[PDB]
Structure 1
Amino acid sequence: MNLMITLLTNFTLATLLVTIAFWLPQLNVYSEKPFSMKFFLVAITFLLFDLEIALLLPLPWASQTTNLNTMLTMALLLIFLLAVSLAYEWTQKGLEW
């Protein structure tokens, strides 16, 4: 709850900074007066590589176990599949401009 106290203090002080930015000047003086496809490919590309990152990233917590051969095997299989997806969109001229 200590970090909740930190989040609360930072949020409240930042809101006070925003209200100093807005409601400070008391001198109320004079009030006066299409999308593309290739944007969308980048987001889903990021999304699927992020999902395979989520699959990869608990690797170093796993490094203390006995079945080292299967670990190294499926780890190389995961990075290889990720690079195969990248090479697939690379050779099928997908993310090009």
Structure 2
Amino acid sequence: NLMLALLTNFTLATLLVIIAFWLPQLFSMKFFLVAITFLLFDLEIALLLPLPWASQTANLNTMLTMALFLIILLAVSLAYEWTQKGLE
């Protein structure tokens, strides 16, 4: 079971918190553009996810023209980013 593996890790992690607490007795809009670029690149990576997974069966002449095309526009987006990006 996967749930048996997960819960045992989390319950012992919370158990250490019980030991940690009970046992002792006595602004800037420029950083937002980073999060914007990250989220927009994630989806291009998400579209480029099935590369070592779909190439096994599908035609190569049809895929290669489209597979590189996603990485091209992933670099073209960065080419627009180069012209005045920021001081950070």
TM over 0.5: yes
Larger Rg: 1
Structure 1 position 90 matched with structure 2 position 82? yes
Identity of aligned residues (%): 93
- Could you tell me how far 1:93 is from its partner in structure 2? 3.4
Deviating more after overlay: 84-93 vs 5-14: 84-93
Question: Any idea what the Cα deviations from partners look like across 1:26-79, whole Å, max 9, x if unmatched?
Answer: 44xxxxxxx122111000100101111101111111112342111000011110
Higher RCO (Cα < 8 Å, 6 or more apart): 2
Please give the root-mean-square deviation of Cα atoms over the aligned residues, in Å: 1.7
Task: Determine if contact 1:89/1:95 at 8 Å carries over to the other structure.
Answer: no
Uncovered stretches (5+) of structure 2, i.e. residues with no partner: none
Structure-2 change in CA distance of 1:64 and 1:95 (3 Å): farther
In 1: Cα distance, 2:72 partner to 2:24 partner: 60
**Runs of 4 or more above 4 Å deviation:** none
In 1: Cα distance, 2:87 partner to 2:48 partner: 24
In 2: Cα distance, 1:63 partner to 1:10 partner: 37
TM-score by length of 2: 0.88
Residue equivalent to 1:16:
15
Structure-2 change in CA distance of 1:77 and 1:95 (3 Å): farther
TM-score by length of 1: 0.81
